Amino acid sequence: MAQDSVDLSCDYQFWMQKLSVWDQASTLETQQDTCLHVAQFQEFLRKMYEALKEMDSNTVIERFPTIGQLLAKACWNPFILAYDESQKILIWCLCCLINKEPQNSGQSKLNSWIQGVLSHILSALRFDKEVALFTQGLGYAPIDYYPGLLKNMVLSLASELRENHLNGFNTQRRMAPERVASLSRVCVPLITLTDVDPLVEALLICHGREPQEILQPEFFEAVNEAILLKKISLPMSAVVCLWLRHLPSLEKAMLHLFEKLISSERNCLRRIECFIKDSSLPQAACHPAIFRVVDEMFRCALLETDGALEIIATIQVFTQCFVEALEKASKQLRFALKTYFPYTSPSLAMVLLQDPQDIPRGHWLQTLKHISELLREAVEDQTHGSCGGPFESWFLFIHFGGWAEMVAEQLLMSAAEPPTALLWLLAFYYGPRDGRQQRAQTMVQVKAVLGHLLAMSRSSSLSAQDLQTVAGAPAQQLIRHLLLNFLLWAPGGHTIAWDVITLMAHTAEITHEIIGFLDQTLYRWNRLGIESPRSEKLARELLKELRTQV
Amino acid sequence: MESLLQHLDRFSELLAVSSTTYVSTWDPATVRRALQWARYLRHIHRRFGRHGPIRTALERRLHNQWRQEGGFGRGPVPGLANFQALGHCDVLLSLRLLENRALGDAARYHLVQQLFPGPGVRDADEETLQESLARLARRRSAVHMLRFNGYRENPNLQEDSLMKTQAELLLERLQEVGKAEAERPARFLSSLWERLPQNNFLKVIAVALLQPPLSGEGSQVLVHWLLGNSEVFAAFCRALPAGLLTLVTSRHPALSPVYLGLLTDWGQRLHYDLQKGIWVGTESQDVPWEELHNRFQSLCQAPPPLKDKVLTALETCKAQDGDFEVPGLSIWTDLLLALR
Amino acid sequence: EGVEPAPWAQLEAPARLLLQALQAGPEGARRGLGVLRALGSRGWEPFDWGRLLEALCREEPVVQGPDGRLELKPLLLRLPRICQRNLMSLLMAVRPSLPESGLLSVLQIAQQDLAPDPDAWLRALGELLRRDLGVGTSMEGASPLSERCQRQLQSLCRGLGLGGRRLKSP
Amino acid sequence: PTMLPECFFLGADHVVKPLGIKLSRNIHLWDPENSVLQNLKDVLEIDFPARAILEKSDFTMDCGICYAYQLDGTIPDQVCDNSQCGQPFHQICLYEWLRGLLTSRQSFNIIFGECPYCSKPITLKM
Ligand SMILES: [Zn+2]
Numbered sequence A: 001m002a003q004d005s006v007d008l009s010c011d012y013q014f015w016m017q018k019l020s021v022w023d024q025a026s027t028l029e030t031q032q033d034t035c036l037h038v039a040q041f042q043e044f045l046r047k048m049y050e051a052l053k054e055m056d057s058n059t060v061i062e063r064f065p066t067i068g069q070l071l072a073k074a075c076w077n078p079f080i081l082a083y084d085e086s087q088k089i090l091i092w093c094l095c096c097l098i099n100k101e102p103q104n105s106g107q108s109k110l111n112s113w114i115q116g117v118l119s120h121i122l123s124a125l126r127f128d129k130e131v132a133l134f135t136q137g138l139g140y141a142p143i144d145y146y147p148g149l150l151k152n153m154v155l156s157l158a159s160e161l162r163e164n165h166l167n168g169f170n171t172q173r174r175m176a177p178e179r180v181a182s183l184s185r186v187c188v189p190l191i192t193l194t195d196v197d198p199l200v201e202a203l204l205i206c207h208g209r210e211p212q213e214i215l216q217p218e219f220f221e222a223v224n225e226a227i228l229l230k231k232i233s234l235p236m237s238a239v240v241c242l243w244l245r246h247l248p249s250l251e252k253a254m255l256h257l258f259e260k261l262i263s264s265e266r267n268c269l270r271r272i273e274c275f276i277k278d279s280s281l282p283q284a285a286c287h288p289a290i291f292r293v294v295d296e297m298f299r300c301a302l303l304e305t306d307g308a309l310e311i312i313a314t315i316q317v318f319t320q321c322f323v324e325a326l327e328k329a330s331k332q333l334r335f336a337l338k339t340y341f342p343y344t345s346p347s348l349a350m351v352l353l354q355d356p357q358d359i360p361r362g363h364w365l366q367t368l369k370h371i372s373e374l375l376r377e378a379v380e381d382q383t384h385g386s387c388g389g390p391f392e393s394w395f396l397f398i399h400f401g402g403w404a405e406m407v408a409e410q411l412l413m414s415a416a417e418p419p420t421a422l423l424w425l426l427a428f429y430y431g432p433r434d435g436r437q438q439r440a441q442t443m444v445q446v447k448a449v450l451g452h453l454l455a456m457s458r459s460s461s462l463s464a465q466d467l468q469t470v471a472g473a474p475a476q477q478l479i480r481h482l483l484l485n486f487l488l489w490a491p492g493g494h495t496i497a498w499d500v501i502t503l504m505a506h507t508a509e510i511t512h513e514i515i516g517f518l519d520q521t522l523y524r525w526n527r528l529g530i531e532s533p534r535s536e537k538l539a540r541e542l543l544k545e546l547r548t549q550v
Numbered sequence B: 001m002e003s004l005l006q007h008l009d010r011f012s013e014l015l016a017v018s019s020t021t022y023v024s025t026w027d028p029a030t031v032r033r034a035l036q037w038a039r040y041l042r043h044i045h046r047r048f049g050r051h052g053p054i055r056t057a058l059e060r061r062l063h064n065q066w067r068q069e070g071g072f073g074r075g076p077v078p079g080l081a082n083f084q085a086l087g088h089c090d091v092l093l094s095l096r097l098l099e100n101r102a103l104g105d106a107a108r109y110h111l112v113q114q115l116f117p118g119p120g121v122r123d124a125d126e127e128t129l130q131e132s133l134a135r136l137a138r139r140r141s142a143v144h145m146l147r148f149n150g151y152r153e154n155p156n157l158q159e160d161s162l163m164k165t166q167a168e169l170l171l172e173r174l175q176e177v178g179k180a181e182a183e184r185p186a187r188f189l190s191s192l193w194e195r196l197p198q199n200n201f202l203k204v205i206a207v208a209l210l211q212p213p214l215s216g217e218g219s220q221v222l223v224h225w226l227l228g229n230s231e232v233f234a235a236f237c238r239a240l241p242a243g244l245l246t247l248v249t250s251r252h253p254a255l256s257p258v259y260l261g262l263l264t265d266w267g268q269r270l271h272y273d274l275q276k277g278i279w280v281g282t283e284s285q286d287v288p289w290e291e292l293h294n295r296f297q298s299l300c301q302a303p304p305p306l307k308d309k310v311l312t313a314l315e316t317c318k319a320q321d322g323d324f325e326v327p328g329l330s331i332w333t334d335l336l337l338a339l340r
Numbered sequence C: 001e002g003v004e005p006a007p008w009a010q011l012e013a014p015a016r017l018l019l020q021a022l023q024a025g026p027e028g029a030r031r032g033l034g035v036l037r038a039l040g041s042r043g044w045e046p047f048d049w050g051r052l053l054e055a056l057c058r059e060e061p062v063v064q065g066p067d068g069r070l071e072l073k074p075l076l077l078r079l080p081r082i083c084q085r086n087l088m089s090l091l092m093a094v095r096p097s098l099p100e101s102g103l104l105s106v107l108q109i110a111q112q113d114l115a116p117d118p119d120a121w122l123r124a125l126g127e128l129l130r131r132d133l134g135v136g137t138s139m140e141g142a143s144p145l146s147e148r149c150q151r152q153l154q155s156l157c158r159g160l161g162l163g164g165r166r167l168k169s170p
Numbered sequence D: 001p002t003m004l005p006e007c008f009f010l011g012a013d014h015v016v017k018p019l020g021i022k023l024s025r026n027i028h029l030w031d032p033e034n035s036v037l038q039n040l041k042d043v044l045e046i047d048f049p050a051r052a053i054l055e056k057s058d059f060t061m062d063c064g065i066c067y068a069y070q071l072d073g074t075i076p077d078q079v080c081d082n083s084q085c086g087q088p089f090h091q092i093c094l095y096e097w098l099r100g101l102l103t104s105r106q107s108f109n110i111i112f113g114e115c116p117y118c119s120k121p122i123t124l125k126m
């Protein structure tokens, strides 16, 4: 509550000096620059509409000088008039500048000119003469055939493009590259007007035989934006071609995942899974190129955070959609996993692909004990003819959710004489790049903590300070997460979980971290169908109440 | 059911007088009454619009109203064109009342605020009048922009958008009058032919004979119309390009022997000069050797059920005019030769 | 007036058939694999790929840019841009069984040094093919992605409380 | 080599499902001190056929463009008039293919031009 006039009064002169440049957008440059600035033009028009709406017309002369010329320039420009609600807003602006009882000559002239310009948007025959004459002859209003006219205009151009497409290197009429670029420029502003969407999908499939791209990326980015905000729903073949010809669109869309796990829906993995399955990523990641690009952005995020549980979770989900999409659309002719997963043994992947839905609850300890063996072979015996290093075999181990998480929950079940292999496995997960020295230290710390915890479980339901003792470094997240597993698993929990939660919630980061832990765990159980309903309800309750505290 | 008659005819009166320049007395009351009547009609379109005798009864009322008016004498009024124009009758009225210059000031203010309430009702399940006008304006721009950026006049008129479209407009309007059976379609088409631009019209009919059937009654009416009027068919066959009329023939064997008749008689009214080794006509309006060659050219590069026909019509006109085996002599010898 | 021959006109039948195939939208890639199994089947079992990877560098002139500019283009930037991306995807998958000498002639082109409007993908598949050979770690920050990507992504994961793992080894 | 490969099965969804389950259950009993066959036989708990048919083993009876049986109802129908190719195709795939070639010419409902695999005259009647 300060400026009100000033920023808009500056941007006014900017836009009026810009509209005069464009001037009915009959040329290439006027169109491309209109295509860009239109949206900010729309927001300008929102602020402008608020200002003109709250106040009244013919009375005030605030920006009334050349508002008329702005709205003329606007409306006779059709790329303006085509955008979401810019028309609707221009209508509203004009309805603000109308007068009920015009008093001086000027007000009546104004209002007539206002009806004129509305009639020019809506109901003007700026179209081929013979069709006007013929229709007027048949006694039709534009209103009652425009739709079918448009529909026929589109199906024509879409057909044309499909024959351009099929006549690849044939002595026959080659649709003019200029004209294809022309159409593409016109797809942008009315992408969310349903009577083009066949045209679009024809443009994206029908690439043709050029070394050069023909389409201008303002096309690709208009389309990308509209896919992600769900204003378009093409078929999936459309959007694999989109990705596979404009890299910054496929960046722009895997980054629009990242906003979803960061801001909106932190640890609502149902919501994240549903966004990934509705986005077409899985099916488009069946093409090995797009898999490799996507997992590069995943790798860049694994490093910015040093192994953030929230990105680990999104990988686990995404990979599960991808793996189900591979299986599905890979009968004949599929690319071999050293193609998607090139920087590891294909051996290791082929183990880690086998899901725990298809193995019994009892034989999972065996599976993990096999994984520990082959990972230790790859990491400790880091010789020629292998993975490049330990980090790579870890970034693989992430891409399987299930296996990395289940280790703690299986250690508690075998806490009496813990297997050394599991201690290796878990230590590796919470810490790569340590030296054998540091892994053995971590393992024996966890072994002592297993002793204390098994004593505490075989005892009655005890305090929270006894756990705070062992809680009191490089191995903290390991112990925290293992401890929470203990709370949820043992029936000695459901009583003293809150009692440890309150203390362990030093910061908000710990709170969010454990919440992510618990969401991952619920998603994991409800998938794998393994449950004690106590633990399920307890996790839900705790998660519900702690998401309010933050 | 009979309740709807007095409602719809009254609204049809108001719609026709929407365009008319008497507007001094009209007010918010007239406007609000109009739009709520139109909502009632649009609501019926939704409720009991399909599979009803009331449906067919309203179309009887429409067509008999649209034929007592005709498009002749008192007003060439478009009118609401069909039962689907029920679904956007409000829109017609509203668009036309903007176009009405005589619209009084305060009525226009109440009007425009009743049509364009604002984003105060942004949340609506029902496609309201503001959103309806939206989609229109968008499409209108949409069609300008495509026409002027990537539209091309297809050679093969049958596959042009506009010819295809205008054809299918005509065929809706013919099917209505066919079922109505009040006047013969012959009368309608003859009057069309006289009233509007002929060059456009012919091309369209042409394109209409080729669209596959949609509900071939349409094509079966127009062929009988054309055989009924030879004189228009003389300008039809003269005005178009060759391939169009050729695929016309392989579709309708009923036009073949008359069309070959037309040129057969156009061939015979030339004369060959020895100075320029070329057939030519006497008058300015006599078809060239090249346009005639063209048309028979196309008819030969066609299906077998026309090839034999054209071949034998030329052989029988060769024998008739001396069975010479040299040029200078028979237009028809010239052709047969020119083909190899 | 506007007849053009296909730029693989003058090639050995099987590679002609491979490259004809990869033309075919995003199912180009698999088609390609299918193509090779259905050439292992036929009389000339071996694919002398370095016949093709020579062929992929071999230049000819084109005249584009202003109405007057002679340029020399290799094959790789001449045949259809969808064949480019589908090719490199097929090479990833077949990397082991290629001679390195010919293969690095491709990547030289691919890296797309000192060109305006480069093939975003091809550049990227350079980087992705070099990481898979093990000669072009390159000692840059040389990742497939844009600076814009990598920047925005560091800028957003900055809004997440970093994990206690140790993955960087200073 | 002797170590575990990336592997998977083609055939009947009802026949293959049990083998996949059994494989996922015995896959920890892979051993790189045996042979590949001596691991596969006792992991999948089976013996193999040593050429159950050596003559009519399989001829790939797929499109040879798209390499699918069942493209939208359509079957591998259109073939080569050649003893050395014989390769089936689809109506759709072969039309899209031949339209594109410079060697192709189209009569009324006929397309003449070269079989993709062997470059011999092949005819397509739509
Ligand atoms: Zn096929």
Ligand SMILES: [Zn+2]
Binding pocket: D080, D081, D082, D085, D086, D087, D115, D116, D117, D118, D119, D120
């Ligand atoms: Zn063949």
